[model samples]
Target: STSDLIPAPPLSKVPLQQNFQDNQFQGKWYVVGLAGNAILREDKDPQKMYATIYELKEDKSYNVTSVLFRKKKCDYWIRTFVPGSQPGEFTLGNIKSYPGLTSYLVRVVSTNYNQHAMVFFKKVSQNREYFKITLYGRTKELTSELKENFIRFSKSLGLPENHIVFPVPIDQCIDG
Candidate 1:
């Protein structure tokens, strides 16, 4: 019944590409847009907001921060990379062991190094009733080429383009 109710396939494990090992994740990234419906509820005006991730340090630790329009609030999250060939992606949470549930799981399907897109998903339950999709990138100031590429990537995922939110300048006044 669980399998019948949840049509999604079993989570597949994919190898992290060499590029992802090299230049793909070694630099700071900003949250430019989101690719799913849940994000809309998380932030009604998902646009006019942004988040950032610093490069992995020599110690393999990194920082994540975000600023949203709702209350002009900013928050930071610290994460560390796991070593080894597969590397298990990065984990951010209060505890170290049992990281997947405590920390966010980086979905293999939602990641693209070349396009500078990083996707994260969290499963709600065994039945898989709900999932969250969070996408991140280099910066709010994206070039035309990068914008086009992101558009294509979002479409490929069957996400609505209009739902996608772009970061807005904090100084500018925005209509609620």
Candidate 2:
């Protein structure tokens, strides 16, 4: 009950991409930046960027493959993203390493389906609610304008400045 003070922003306030199209949105995207609150703020360590590939399956769910480099090893995982009632809304199922995560809600807050995309991730882990704003680029890098958009959206969510980071791209794990 005490944690009720900070709840996930109402869906009304979190706008989804207008006229979202599935075919255009499904592809390879590099997670270039990220920002968050509380738990993410507490950690000051540098973070590395990763890559994710998405493919729509049967107009019902999406097959997602994520690649990350950790502990000198390249880690890859695949999961299904179930479409929500609304367009641009999805929930990731079957999390592996992140055992604490109970729910992961994803929203395509904004995107052009070409150069850049801005995504919102709300996670409920151990009953603690937190969110992460992600900046995705069709390539490994995005324009300054899109980068600024990421910061603006993060600030709109009231995330601290220090908690936002443009993760250094890890070339080793990108191609998979």
Candidate 3:
């Protein structure tokens, strides 16, 4: 139920990158950390790290591909991201897989293009709503400063420490 939602400020209050460039942002990134309220648990098995590839189209849209390792097998999913009014804002396009999903919104909250990036995702479903923050890197590991910034931003958004997690890195499902 949406009644169990965490107390947090409006997503509009969350800042976006001032100079977000789509050309520089398109690349393969490793998901190193994730923070989500209600949809994540610390006691459960740690989630596996994943990879995402972004290809910018001429229309400014993007081909977003995800690679995940699960059950000793590699899984992949591809979706389209339509650009939003803001430079760093986007919305899911015509990709339907999750049950009851109504809308999906994404934003590049911060990124240096070459090294680390911080992204925010908001998913609204028929009976639930959740927010997830993803910390990405060009490689499997991140510098302490990048991690600290991610933690600081997550806390600022009202997510507790327990909701933040560093996924266990794996070599599979990385190249595609």
The best candidate by TM-score is: 3
lDDT of 2 by residue, 21-107 (tens): 888988889988888775253355667888888899985688988888899888988988888778899988666557888888888
In the range 1-176, model 3's lDDT, one tens digit per residue, is: 22676754588768899989999999899998898776465566878889999999999999999999988898888988899878999999884766788888899998989988999988787856788889999899998888888888888988988888888788888855
Best by lDDT: 3
Our model 3 lands, by Cα RMSD against the true structure, at 2.0
Off by over 4 Å in 2: 1-7, 38-45, 94-102
Clashes of each: 0, 0, 0
Worst 10 residues of 1 by lDDT: 1-10
Of models 1 and 2, which has the larger lDDT? 2
TM-scores for every candidate against the unseen true structure: 0.56, 0.85, 0.90
Tens digits of per-residue lDDT for model 1 on 23-101?
Answer: 3455545566555433342355435545555565566655443444455544444454443234435544444444334
57 Cα displacement, candidate 2 (Å): 1.4
lDDT of each: 0.46, 0.80, 0.86
The parts of candidate 3 lying over 4 Å away from their true place are 1-3, 39-44, 95-99
Q: Candidate 2 — worst ten consecutive residues by lDDT sum?
A: 1-10
